[PDB]
Amino acid sequence: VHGEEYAQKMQKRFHQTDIWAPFRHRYAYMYNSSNKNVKDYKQVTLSRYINGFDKFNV
Amino acid sequence: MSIFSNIWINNDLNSYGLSILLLNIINYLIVFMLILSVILLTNLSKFKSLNQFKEFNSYNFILYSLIFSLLSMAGIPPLLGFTGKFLAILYSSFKSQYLLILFMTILNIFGMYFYIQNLRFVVKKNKSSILNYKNYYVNINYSITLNIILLNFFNFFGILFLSDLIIILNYISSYIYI
Amino acid sequence: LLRLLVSEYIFFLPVFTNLFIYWHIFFKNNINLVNKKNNWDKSISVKNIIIKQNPSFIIRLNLLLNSLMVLYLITFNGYSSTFWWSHFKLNNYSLYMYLLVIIFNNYFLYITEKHIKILNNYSIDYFFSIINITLFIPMIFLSNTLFTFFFLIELVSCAIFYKFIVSKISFKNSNYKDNYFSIFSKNYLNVLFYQYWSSFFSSVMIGFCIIYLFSLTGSTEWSIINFIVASNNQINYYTNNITLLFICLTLIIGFIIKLGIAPIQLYKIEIYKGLPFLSIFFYTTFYFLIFFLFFSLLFIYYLSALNNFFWIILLIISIIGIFYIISIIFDINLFKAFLAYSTIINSISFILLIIAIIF
Amino acid sequence: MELNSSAKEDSHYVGVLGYPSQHDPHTLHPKKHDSTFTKVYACRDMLWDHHWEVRNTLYAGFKGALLGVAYASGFGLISKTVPSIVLKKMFRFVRNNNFGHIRIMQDLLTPYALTGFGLGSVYYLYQHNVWENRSNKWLAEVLSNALFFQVATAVCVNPGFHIYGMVGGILFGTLKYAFYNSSFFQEKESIGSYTTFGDLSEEERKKQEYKDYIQFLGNYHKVRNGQLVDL
Amino acid sequence: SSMLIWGACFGLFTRAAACKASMIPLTTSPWKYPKYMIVSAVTFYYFDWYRRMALEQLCYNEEKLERYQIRAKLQSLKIGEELSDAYRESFFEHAVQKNNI
Amino acid sequence: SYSGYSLNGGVHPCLPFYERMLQCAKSEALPIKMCTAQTEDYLECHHRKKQYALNYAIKKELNNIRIVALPRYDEENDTFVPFSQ
Amino acid sequence: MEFSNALLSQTKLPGQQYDYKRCFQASNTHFECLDSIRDAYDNHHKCPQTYQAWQSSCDVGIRRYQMDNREQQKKDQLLYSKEQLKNYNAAKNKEAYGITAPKNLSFAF
Amino acid sequence: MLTWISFWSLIFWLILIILVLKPKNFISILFMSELTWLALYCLSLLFGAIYCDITLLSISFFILGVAGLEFSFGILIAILYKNLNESLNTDLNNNNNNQNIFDKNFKTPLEKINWQ
Amino acid sequence: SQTFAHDSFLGGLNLFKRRDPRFVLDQGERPPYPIINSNSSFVDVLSNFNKADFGLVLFSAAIGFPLSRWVLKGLTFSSLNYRRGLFSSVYGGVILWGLVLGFNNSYYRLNGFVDNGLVWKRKERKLNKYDFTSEFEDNSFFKKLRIRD
């Protein structure tokens, strides 16, 4: 809506286009840079006691 | 730093100021070490207050050595402490900083009075007797005396040999960028 | 790591040898009284058990080792480069500063050795602290990042604190009126307190500056920092003048507190009041040769890319300092205060010279 | 770090290079086919007009008041001693009021803010209306600042210290000319730069530059005095 | 003049001045007189060589410092001056001709 | 003090940008004016300022009534179907 | 700093080392492939294989220093010779023993 | 409700301000200095995570070490306060009248001033 | 000028012969002598040891005795055992410094910074534009300390 040249100027990040450096707010460190809990805090505190929270990857 | 037909000509060393700063530091250290050697010859417990500069009035070597060290610290022209301040003012004028020159002038005059104020306290009614005793007799050190002799020579006549020190310091400072 | 090059650590060998010799001799001196007399042993004379070592030989040892270090420089060869993961720099100017500080330390040590035979009012631990300081400061000259400079400066500050701790407190004099009465001196406590808290403030602010320099640039290497700052000035990418101003201000104020410069010069007066003359001797040479020279080279050489932010700050401080001391230096009545104010005035003059240089 | 960057711009050099100009019209022009609300909102360009005398005076007064408040916060209030009875009454007032600290702060900082506002406004009106057309800029700055600071020291501080006020005014005027009027450590060009405008070809310019170099060779003392040995 | 003789003269007067300053008689500890002249003559003789050899390296250093000043000036140009006709040709010489690596 | 290591012992994501910037700087006679693109790329890798500006613009645009519904994505094939169907 | 090629050439990646033997061998071979044909401006394309070896063997900073030194040497050779340099140095050191007098009442300016 | 970077910068500077604010008791200043070091620890970890830099975690543990040595020095200095005739409240070590203290009162160790 | 022959007991003296007062060469500057092993390791330097480094060690052993005696002249309130132990410590330190010097000499010969018995195929022509030392050295002892004045 603000001009075709404006959009490509705003969506442009790197002069060189042969390097992939995706945007990240932060970088993970724990668990060899991974996530152990991929659930909400309520699911975090309830899945340890209550059944029906884990979908049983088989 | 001018240009003629894409040929650059420069008449500025660009490393003179660092050598000037090194010279100022080294000269201050030399004069300070002279006065501390004069102090280290004597009994240290006597110098507590500022009026006790009178204690330096013992015999002609100590008295005159410290008088000239104080005058050098004050920046009196003939002595060594003057050369660093003179070259600092010269470099500031070369760099076209008149406000810095004015503030250094104010600082220099106030510090000069701060230094020469103690020359009034040196006056004593009698000889001070500020020497340590050993084997019933005063202990006069010869090695510190010779060190003070050399420092006094280079305080009195260091302005004659300052060119070599400037050469060496500029040679050292030329390595900063290369 | 497939190969460890000698060029990465060649410079450290003489320093390690000197440290080992120093500390071995210190440990062996610590037990110089223990000497068992066996049942089949015979003593030509009765052993004296109350002794007072003269530290002269220790000073001599220092001189010798320091002199040997000079030799290592005179025969030095190599390339202009970096070593130990680009944490240390080897070029002509750094090595010349190293040589200069070594030779000045050697001269001061020689005069101290001459003076120590007139009257022994100092212990062996005093000159061991001096040994450590003279061993470690030229490595402060050889720094290549603000990280390693910070760590070296804390090492040397701890050595200086150790030197201040081992000052002689009680003396044998001719005052016989003070028996059976309590006299409080309080000079020792003031020296320790002020040195401790000034070190704390300087260290925390330097760490703060290091953290923000990593945030802004990604390294604390001098060349990378200068190149990034200049390229950003050309590009107009990072336009947060507040952050750069605050970084420069925090570094400058940390160094002001560390050096006791004119705005914060008061605690140096107390430190000088509580110190012996030899301590002031060594402290002055260490302060002017190393601390103030590095403070100068920060604006001149190490962080020149930030001079466009530095100058004004320095200017303000200079002005304040002058207008703070043109009257305070005229209501002192102590020899130590006179010496300290001499140092302070010369520091202000040299700061003005730095401002002239960076133009 | 820049001071008075708008007044030190070289307009010709900036226009030749194409650099953005700080004297360009930074104004908003409402057009028709727009609602009545955006007409009112677009009037905010009044506060951007640096040629408005009332706005400049108010901004100078605001800066002076802010400086006075800062001085009171850092150095003024802590040095002065308050009677114990007054402090006790103030702390009792805090006990019986939800935001009593704000009222105490207002009472303590009102004189300093008022004095700073008055000083800033008077200083701006004095500089802009009296000394703005003098030929010698350095002398005008020195004299005006010396007189103003002497009067300010006489009024705000004890009148027996007016000589030190004059000296401080002289020093402040020198500093202001050195760094607020002139451009040291803050330069928008390069030393020795120039712009060419004629239709001369490269050969003519090169010939003129060769002549200039021949003339420049006479600035060497050894060359001019003929004191060079044979190489 | 000769530096060896100048140094020997320096040591002779240094010893006599030290005797006067310590209030000890001259003619005392005579063997220190030849030692002072020998030490002082060698000291100033080496310094004469070192100062001359520092001038040589200083002059050669300024040739490299000559190149640094020109490139520092071009890199310190204000933006927009690089392609200005005052500096365009000199700037292009370093960017193009000096790309010989 | 640039190590090139990531938080799990791997490789820093901005290592190629740093390498190219240093290669440009060490080869040019005027590195400051001749390595602007590489230094800009490294600075964008380190401070993600352009992405933050894009996010600010996107939020400002989303504050309006420009967008009503988005196409739906079906997992079976890499195709977007409109919300209408 | 921030402007000197000398200080930038000392900046290297972590874990980056230089093989000076191979680099100097390649540089000597390339400079002997050159210097047999003499030009005011060095053309590396006239010595292609040695140019490629030199590029693949030596770092960019080393090559920049080598080109700067070569340019300085070529400039110096066109202006000076050993004998006239020796004569000039002897004359300068001889006149250093004398003094310098003002040129009172000049004519040129 | 505040971004972590601005929050932690402000927290560090507020900790310094509070350290200056509180009455000058050596033990209190020691505790506040330890808190300052811990704030630096947290800030270094936060920026290390944000910028994927491994040297700032090193800064965290080096801060731990430096703070430990400094705390040992502080303990020894307080015990040194014991032996010298000094109060842990430094404001009681001088005769400068202070309005902030309710009960500051020092006089000469004399029973009377005048005899005749 | 002529330098002491390497792989001989007087080779270490070449450490005191220099062409310029520089500590180190530039990044791209060629060493004065051909390079044997640029990226040497710890055992590469040890394997390069010969009579010159052993001569450096022997000189350290010879000169350590007066230096240790001079240090020992500062002892008071000491016994025979402590005096002998301190003398041994100082002497061993001087021996260690001599070994360090020998290691550095071997490293320098490996890198080509000092005379290692090899000559470059092409000589680097240098024009002696600035000359303050040639005649002074030729009329002095300092001609021994300078290489190619």
Side-chain angles (χ1 to χ4, degrees):
Chain A
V1 301
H2 301 301
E4 182 65 26
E5 65 183 1
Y6 169 79
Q8 63 84 30
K9 262 153 58 180
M10 290 290 310
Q11 287 167 88
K12 195 252 197 187
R13 275 194 80 216
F14 293 120
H15 280 291
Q16 308 154 114
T17 69
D18 63 358
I19 297 162
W20 189 39
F23 169 65
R24 290 191 157 108
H25 288 93
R26 90 192 282 286
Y27 290 84
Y29 155 71
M30 286 296 294
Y31 303 112
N32 205 359
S33 288
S34 281
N35 297 98
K36 174 197 264 195
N37 306 309
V38 191
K39 53 182 72 175
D40 291 331
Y41 290 106
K42 176 200 206 163
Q43 304 180 262
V44 161
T45 187
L46 284 190
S47 50
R48 202 52 184 204
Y49 285 92
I50 301 299
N51 197 9
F53 271 104
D54 176 37
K55 299 289 95 176
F56 296 152
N57 294 321
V58 187
Chain B
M1 191 68 201
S2 45
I3 187 168
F4 302 96
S5 286
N6 317 301
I7 295 90
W8 290 90
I9 296 89
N10 45 0
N11 305 328
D12 300 355
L13 190 43
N14 203 19
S15 65
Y16 206 69
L18 183 51
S19 60
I20 289 316
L21 173 73
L22 289 170
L23 178 72
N24 281 255
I25 288 179
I26 287 174
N27 280 1
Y28 177 86
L29 271 171
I30 286 160
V31 186
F32 167 88
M33 184 177 177
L34 192 155
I35 199 178
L36 272 294
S37 311
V38 166
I39 285 165
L40 282 177
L41 268 181
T42 77
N43 179 27
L44 265 56
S45 58
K46 291 306 181 65
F47 310 104
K48 313 184 270 287
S49 283
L50 267 193
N51 67 292
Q52 291 174 323
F53 267 95
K54 69 176 77 172
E55 301 313 311
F56 290 110
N57 196 4
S58 58
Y59 60 91
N60 263 1
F61 189 54
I62 309 303
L63 166 74
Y64 277 85
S65 304
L66 187 152
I67 279 168
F68 288 128
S69 79
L70 270 184
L71 290 170
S72 184
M73 269 168 222
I76 296 317
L79 307 176
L80 182 75
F82 154 87
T83 78
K85 302 180 173 58
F86 187 25
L87 270 156
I89 303 283
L90 284 149
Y91 182 73
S92 301
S93 184
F94 172 71
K95 298 301 288 290
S96 301
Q97 300 300 313
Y98 51 88
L99 186 151
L100 293 183
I101 285 157
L102 157 70
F103 276 108
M104 293 182 286
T105 317
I106 286 160
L107 197 61
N108 281 357
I109 190 63
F110 273 99
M112 163 184 317
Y113 197 72
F114 164 78
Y115 282 117
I116 71 176
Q117 202 175 218
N118 314 320
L119 280 163
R120 184 192 143 150
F121 307 142
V122 185
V123 183
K124 208 181 175 299
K125 293 187 286 185
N126 50 77
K127 285 318 171 185
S128 62
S129 178
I130 53 153
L131 289 155
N132 285 308
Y133 301 95
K134 184 178 184 293
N135 305 342
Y136 308 147
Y137 284 107
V138 285
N139 196 342
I140 295 163
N141 201 357
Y142 172 78
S143 306
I144 299 185
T145 303
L146 179 80
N147 187 68
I148 294 172
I149 290 285
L150 302 172
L151 286 159
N152 268 6
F153 173 87
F154 280 110
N155 190 33
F156 300 156
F157 312 116
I159 200 154
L160 302 165
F161 318 95
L162 193 67
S163 277
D164 291 331
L165 187 44
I166 286 168
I167 281 165
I168 295 181
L169 289 197
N170 277 291
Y171 152 73
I172 294 169
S173 160
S174 58
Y175 285 123
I176 193 77
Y177 295 137
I178 211 66
Chain C
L1 182 86
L2 284 190
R3 185 176 277 281
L4 189 44
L5 296 198
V6 173
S7 50
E8 279 269 302
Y9 58 88
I10 183 70
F11 194 89
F12 290 140
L13 303 185
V15 186
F16 283 168
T17 58
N18 264 4
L19 180 89
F20 274 54
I21 294 155
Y22 279 138
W23 279 86
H24 171 73
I25 284 176
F26 191 57
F27 266 66
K28 258 173 68 175
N29 173 78
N30 280 352
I31 52 155
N32 79 94
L33 276 297
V34 174
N35 188 41
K36 194 185 284 174
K37 176 199 157 92
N38 288 310
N39 292 294
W40 65 90
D41 271 311
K42 180 179 182 295
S43 304
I44 190 178
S45 172
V46 167
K47 166 190 192 168
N48 178 58
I49 57 171
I50 295 92
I51 74 165
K52 181 132 164 58
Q53 295 297 109
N54 214 10
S56 309
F57 69 100
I58 284 294
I59 298 164
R60 282 169 189 251
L61 168 78
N62 198 358
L63 289 157
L64 177 75
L65 291 205
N66 212 8
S67 289
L68 284 158
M69 195 62 184
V70 160
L71 190 63
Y72 171 70
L73 294 186
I74 305 306
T75 67
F76 194 75
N77 289 279
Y79 294 108
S80 310
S81 69
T82 49
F83 68 98
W84 208 246
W85 306 99
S86 289
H87 267 71
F88 299 89
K89 176 65 72 71
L90 268 185
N91 58 359
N92 274 287
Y93 184 77
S94 302
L95 285 155
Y96 264 113
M97 298 286 102
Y98 205 111
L99 181 59
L100 185 72
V101 59
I102 292 178
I103 64 146
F104 264 88
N105 285 178
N106 213 41
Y107 188 30
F108 275 77
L109 281 167
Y110 176 80
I111 298 301
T112 305
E113 207 277 336
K114 289 311 186 175
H115 157 73
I116 194 66
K117 302 192 181 74
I118 305 164
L119 205 59
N120 183 27
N121 269 337
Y122 315 88
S123 47
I124 293 188
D125 305 84
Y126 186 79
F127 297 112
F128 196 60
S129 45
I130 279 158
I131 277 175
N132 284 285
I133 301 164
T134 62
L135 191 61
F136 288 125
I137 44 178
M139 265 171 302
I140 297 169
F141 290 168
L142 283 179
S143 308
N144 194 52
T145 69
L146 196 54
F147 203 61
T148 177
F149 165 71
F150 157 85
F151 278 86
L152 285 159
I153 210 69
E154 324 290 329
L155 176 57
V156 160
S157 293
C158 173
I160 284 172
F161 202 63
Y162 170 37
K163 174 184 74 168
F164 283 0
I165 281 169
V166 291
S167 301
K168 189 174 180 135
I169 299 176
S170 283
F171 286 82
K172 177 251 185 162
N173 45 24
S174 312
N175 168 239
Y176 320 121
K177 324 190 282 296
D178 277 357
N179 294 317
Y180 323 120
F181 197 81
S182 297
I183 297 89
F184 324 118
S185 180
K186 305 165 185 300
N187 289 289
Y188 194 66
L189 194 64
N190 288 338
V191 164
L192 296 194
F193 177 97
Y194 286 124
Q195 171 73 13
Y196 178 84
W197 289 118
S198 300
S199 288
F200 156 78
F201 274 118
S202 67
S203 304
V204 294
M205 293 177 71
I206 293 301
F208 202 66
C209 288
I210 286 173
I211 288 174
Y212 291 169
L213 277 171
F214 279 105
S215 73
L216 167 79
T217 306
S219 81
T220 49
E221 204 177 340
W222 309 120
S223 62
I224 293 311
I225 284 182
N226 285 294
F227 184 77
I228 287 291
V229 169
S231 314
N232 164 52
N233 280 1
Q234 161 82 1
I235 287 161
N236 217 22
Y237 172 81
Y238 195 92
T239 64
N240 189 179
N241 288 336
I242 292 184
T243 301
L244 300 162
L245 167 68
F246 200 72
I247 288 171
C248 296
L249 211 47
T250 310
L251 185 89
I252 282 179
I253 294 179
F255 264 88
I256 294 293
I257 294 163
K258 179 71 146 190
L259 301 191
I261 306 182
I264 309 299
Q265 92 287 22
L266 281 188
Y267 80 97
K268 200 197 271 283
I269 312 296
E270 303 299 306
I271 293 191
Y272 271 52
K273 273 165 56 169
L275 275 178
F277 277 108
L278 211 61
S279 283
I280 292 162
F281 200 46
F282 275 105
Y283 184 78
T284 309
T285 189
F286 298 150
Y287 166 88
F288 271 98
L289 271 193
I290 300 96
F291 290 168
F292 201 92
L293 192 40
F294 206 94
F295 177 68
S296 296
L297 288 169
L298 267 189
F299 320 106
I300 292 175
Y301 173 63
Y302 291 114
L303 296 166
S304 48
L306 295 148
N307 284 124
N308 69 323
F309 276 104
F310 279 143
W311 65 277
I312 174 67
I313 295 157
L314 288 183
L315 184 56
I316 296 174
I317 281 162
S318 282
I319 305 308
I320 291 175
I322 302 179
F323 291 139
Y324 192 41
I325 75 153
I326 49 164
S327 66
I328 297 196
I329 67 180
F330 286 112
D331 56 301
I332 58 156
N333 44 20
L334 295 174
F335 208 86
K336 313 295 195 75
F338 156 77
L339 291 166
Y341 271 122
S342 162
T343 284
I344 287 146
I345 293 156
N346 272 258
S347 297
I348 304 174
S349 316
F350 300 166
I351 284 170
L352 286 157
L353 176 58
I354 294 154
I355 297 176
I357 287 164
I358 66 170
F359 183 79
Chain D
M1 287 308 260
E2 310 270 336
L3 309 93
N4 201 23
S5 78
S6 180
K8 297 180 221 192
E9 158 181 344
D10 197 12
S11 315
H12 173 270
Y13 206 69
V14 162
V16 163
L17 283 199
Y19 201 81
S21 163
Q22 318 210 18
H23 294 121
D24 264 18
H26 182 238
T27 46
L28 296 158
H29 306 108
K31 73 171 186 65
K32 302 309 286 291
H33 203 203
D34 285 28
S35 72
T36 183
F37 180 82
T38 188
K39 305 277 188 66
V40 188
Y41 189 42
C43 305
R44 72 189 173 280
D45 60 345
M46 294 182 286
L47 272 65
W48 304 342
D49 199 20
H50 64 295
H51 298 283
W52 192 3
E53 284 320 297
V54 177
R55 181 206 83 95
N56 295 332
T57 311
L58 285 184
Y59 272 45
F62 151 75
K63 293 190 201 101
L66 189 148
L67 282 185
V69 160
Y71 166 75
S73 309
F75 308 86
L77 303 170
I78 193 81
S79 52
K80 290 190 184 71
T81 178
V82 194
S84 293
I85 182 74
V86 181
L87 281 177
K88 280 153 201 191
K89 284 300 182 192
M90 270 156 51
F91 304 150
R92 181 200 170 221
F93 177 84
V94 178
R95 272 178 257 128
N96 311 339
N97 284 82
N98 270 337
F99 296 91
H101 274 94
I102 308 187
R103 275 69 174 174
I104 286 191
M105 294 299 291
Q106 173 212 16
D107 291 331
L108 287 181
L109 294 176
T110 290
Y112 294 89
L114 263 55
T115 302
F117 196 100
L119 280 175
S121 293
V122 165
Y123 184 89
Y124 170 77
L125 288 180
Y126 172 66
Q127 286 287 318
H128 179 264
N129 277 131
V130 179
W131 298 90
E132 76 163 356
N133 290 333
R134 298 297 88 195
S135 301
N136 200 347
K137 294 287 150 46
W138 179 84
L139 189 74
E141 278 314 304
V142 159
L143 291 183
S144 47
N145 281 298
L147 191 148
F148 189 91
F149 274 51
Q150 181 186 36
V151 172
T153 301
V155 164
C156 286
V157 190
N158 200 256
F161 296 153
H162 60 96
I163 297 169
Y164 311 120
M166 185 180 288
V167 176
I170 284 167
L171 294 173
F172 178 75
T174 287
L175 179 78
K176 181 184 172 190
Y177 183 83
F179 298 106
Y180 181 78
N181 293 122
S182 160
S183 45
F184 278 170
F185 302 89
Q186 49 186 356
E187 300 161 10
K188 300 311 171 79
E189 304 186 359
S190 295
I191 302 291
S193 58
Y194 61 92
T195 61
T196 78
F197 69 94
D199 289 317
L200 320 178
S201 58
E202 293 156 334
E203 304 319 295
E204 280 156 320
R205 292 215 179 269
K206 265 194 295 197
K207 201 204 197 193
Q208 191 46 250
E209 290 175 352
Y210 296 147
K211 287 177 182 38
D212 289 338
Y213 172 68
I214 285 302
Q215 171 185 3
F216 158 81
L217 265 172
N219 286 340
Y220 289 113
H221 308 325
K222 286 312 210 319
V223 166
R224 169 168 32 83
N225 289 332
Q227 280 155 339
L228 299 166
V229 300
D230 209 313
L231 193 150
Chain E
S1 290
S2 173
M3 193 51 89
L4 279 178
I5 301 190
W6 199 94
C9 293
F10 183 83
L12 168 83
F13 285 122
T14 292
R15 172 82 181 114
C19 283
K20 284 184 62 85
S22 302
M23 294 182 286
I24 56 170
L26 278 65
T27 308
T28 293
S29 178
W31 63 93
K32 292 208 167 285
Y33 273 108
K35 174 200 184 156
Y36 274 35
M37 320 165 69
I38 286 170
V39 164
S40 179
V42 172
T43 292
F44 284 108
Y45 196 54
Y46 173 79
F47 178 77
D48 194 17
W49 180 61
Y50 184 73
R51 69 167 181 158
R52 293 159 168 279
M53 184 177 177
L55 287 172
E56 295 196 2
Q57 199 44 58
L58 175 52
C59 289
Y60 284 114
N61 275 356
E62 298 182 71
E63 277 166 16
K64 308 175 172 187
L65 188 153
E66 179 90 33
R67 194 180 318 118
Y68 166 77
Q69 266 165 330
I70 293 159
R71 295 181 181 180
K73 171 96 173 89
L74 286 175
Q75 280 168 90
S76 73
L77 294 182
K78 303 315 174 314
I79 190 165
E81 293 189 314
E82 309 94 346
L83 295 189
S84 88
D85 63 358
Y87 302 110
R88 213 205 311 111
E89 182 65 26
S90 187
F91 178 82
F92 280 151
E93 172 210 340
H94 285 256
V96 186
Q97 264 55 63
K98 305 285 189 47
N99 206 38
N100 189 359
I101 71 168
Chain F
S1 290
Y2 184 86
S3 55
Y5 287 110
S6 74
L7 284 189
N8 67 335
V11 172
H12 199 277
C14 299
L15 182 62
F17 287 121
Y18 185 85
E19 190 264 339
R20 273 166 193 204
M21 177 189 48
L22 260 68
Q23 181 86 350
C24 181
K26 285 154 84 171
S27 86
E28 302 268 11
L30 316 160
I32 290 304
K33 306 228 164 293
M34 293 281 98
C35 301
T36 46
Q38 278 86 22
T39 315
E40 197 172 4
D41 276 7
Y42 170 79
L43 283 180
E44 176 55 33
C45 191
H46 187 76
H47 324 270
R48 284 81 78 186
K49 184 181 163 236
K50 278 157 202 269
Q51 179 63 246
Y52 279 107
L54 177 56
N55 288 341
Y56 183 93
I58 291 303
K59 180 187 170 54
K60 188 269 183 181
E61 266 311 285
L62 268 171
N63 272 349
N64 310 342
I65 321 292
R66 176 70 187 172
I67 287 278
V68 181
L70 277 72
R72 268 190 69 249
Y73 180 79
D74 62 358
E75 191 70 26
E76 293 315 296
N77 49 2
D78 272 324
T79 313
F80 282 90
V81 285
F83 174 97
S84 86
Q85 65 182 177
Chain G
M1 319 177 49
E2 77 194 284
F3 289 142
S4 60
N5 308 71
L7 277 155
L8 276 192
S9 45
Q10 283 142 38
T11 311
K12 57 181 200 176
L13 296 175
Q16 164 168 24
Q17 305 293 329
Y18 300 122
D19 198 312
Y20 286 108
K21 192 174 178 190
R22 300 176 71 253
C23 166
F24 281 132
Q25 278 178 353
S27 76
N28 288 342
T29 311
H30 183 43
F31 292 160
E32 294 294 328
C33 183
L34 262 52
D35 274 1
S36 59
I37 55 169
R38 60 186 63 83
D39 291 331
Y41 185 85
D42 289 334
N43 193 352
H44 299 301
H45 311 316
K46 310 180 130 180
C47 274
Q49 69 276 17
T50 47
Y51 179 44
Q52 183 66 41
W54 183 59
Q55 268 182 158
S56 88
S57 279
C58 294
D59 204 55
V60 285
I62 309 184
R63 296 211 311 269
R64 178 65 65 192
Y65 174 87
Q66 277 161 350
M67 294 298 102
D68 277 1
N69 204 58
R70 203 160 152 76
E71 165 190 18
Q72 168 74 240
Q73 273 167 358
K74 291 174 70 175
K75 169 192 179 166
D76 268 356
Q77 281 161 6
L78 279 158
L79 291 178
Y80 305 122
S81 88
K82 280 165 41 64
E83 202 47 50
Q84 65 182 177
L85 271 187
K86 176 173 183 175
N87 296 323
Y88 167 78
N89 278 297
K92 211 75 189 179
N93 288 329
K94 181 69 176 177
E95 62 86 20
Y97 289 5
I99 73 157
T100 309
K103 279 290 193 39
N104 298 338
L105 304 188
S106 191
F107 60 89
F109 297 81
Chain H
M1 197 177 60
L2 210 67
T3 310
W4 284 122
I5 297 159
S6 59
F7 179 76
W8 274 106
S9 312
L10 184 62
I11 290 303
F12 171 80
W13 289 109
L14 285 188
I15 285 177
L16 275 179
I17 289 161
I18 295 163
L19 187 149
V20 180
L21 181 145
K22 279 183 77 42
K24 290 320 157 303
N25 190 293
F26 190 71
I27 295 146
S28 290
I29 305 167
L30 199 55
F31 291 165
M32 294 299 291
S33 69
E34 202 65 0
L35 191 68
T36 311
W37 277 120
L38 300 190
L40 277 176
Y41 171 101
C42 278
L43 174 87
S44 87
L45 277 172
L46 167 73
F47 279 170
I50 287 167
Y51 287 110
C52 200
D53 189 358
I54 73 154
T55 310
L56 311 190
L57 290 66
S58 298
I59 306 194
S60 85
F61 276 178
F62 284 131
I63 286 168
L64 280 195
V66 164
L69 182 88
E70 183 178 1
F71 204 75
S72 287
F73 283 163
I75 289 169
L76 274 175
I77 292 164
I79 285 146
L80 186 73
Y81 269 80
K82 182 268 290 180
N83 208 358
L84 283 85
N85 193 47
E86 292 269 299
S87 170
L88 284 163
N89 308 295
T90 69
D91 291 331
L92 295 192
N93 290 319
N94 44 1
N95 204 24
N96 299 334
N97 296 115
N98 200 346
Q99 213 164 1
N100 281 275
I101 294 160
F102 294 85
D103 61 323
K104 192 144 158 58
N105 189 288
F106 288 139
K107 65 181 71 209
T108 190
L110 278 191
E111 172 259 320
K112 75 184 156 193
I113 297 300
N114 299 312
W115 296 62
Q116 318 208 339
Chain I
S1 304
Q2 184 60 259
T3 56
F4 277 94
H6 72 93
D7 79 2
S8 78
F9 276 123
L10 296 177
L13 296 198
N14 283 338
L15 280 178
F16 298 95
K17 290 161 173 292
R18 295 185 93 82
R19 310 162 199 265
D20 44 8
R22 270 182 318 168
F23 274 108
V24 293
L25 315 164
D26 294 297
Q27 172 56 236
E29 203 189 327
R30 202 174 75 165
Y33 299 95
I35 311 182
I36 311 164
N37 195 354
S38 176
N39 316 98
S40 43
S41 193
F42 190 83
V43 299
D44 305 331
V45 182
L46 279 194
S47 301
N48 209 43
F49 262 68
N50 52 18
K51 277 73 69 177
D53 312 326
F54 284 113
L56 276 162
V57 177
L58 276 149
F59 187 97
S60 74
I63 195 167
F65 207 94
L67 298 166
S68 305
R69 290 218 74 87
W70 168 79
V71 165
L72 210 74
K73 292 181 181 179
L75 262 179
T76 54
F77 282 101
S78 181
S79 55
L80 207 58
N81 212 53
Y82 182 62
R83 198 174 277 279
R84 291 164 105 239
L86 189 52
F87 175 83
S88 298
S89 291
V90 178
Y91 206 57
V94 180
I95 303 312
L96 261 174
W97 259 101
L99 292 160
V100 162
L101 287 190
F103 187 91
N104 290 318
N105 187 58
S106 166
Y107 174 73
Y108 293 159
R109 286 177 301 182
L110 268 189
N111 286 54
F113 302 138
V114 296
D115 186 26
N116 51 0
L118 302 155
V119 292
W120 282 112
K121 184 178 184 293
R122 46 204 294 277
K123 187 269 183 182
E124 295 286 275
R125 43 196 78 84
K126 172 178 186 76
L127 283 175
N128 200 354
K129 319 175 51 180
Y130 321 101
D131 187 276
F132 308 89
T133 50
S134 69
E135 61 86 20
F136 179 88
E137 283 168 345
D138 293 322
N139 305 141
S140 80
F141 181 76
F142 300 115
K143 55 159 85 77
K144 279 97 186 165
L145 293 158
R146 188 90 179 263
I147 307 173
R148 320 209 300 185
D149 60 356

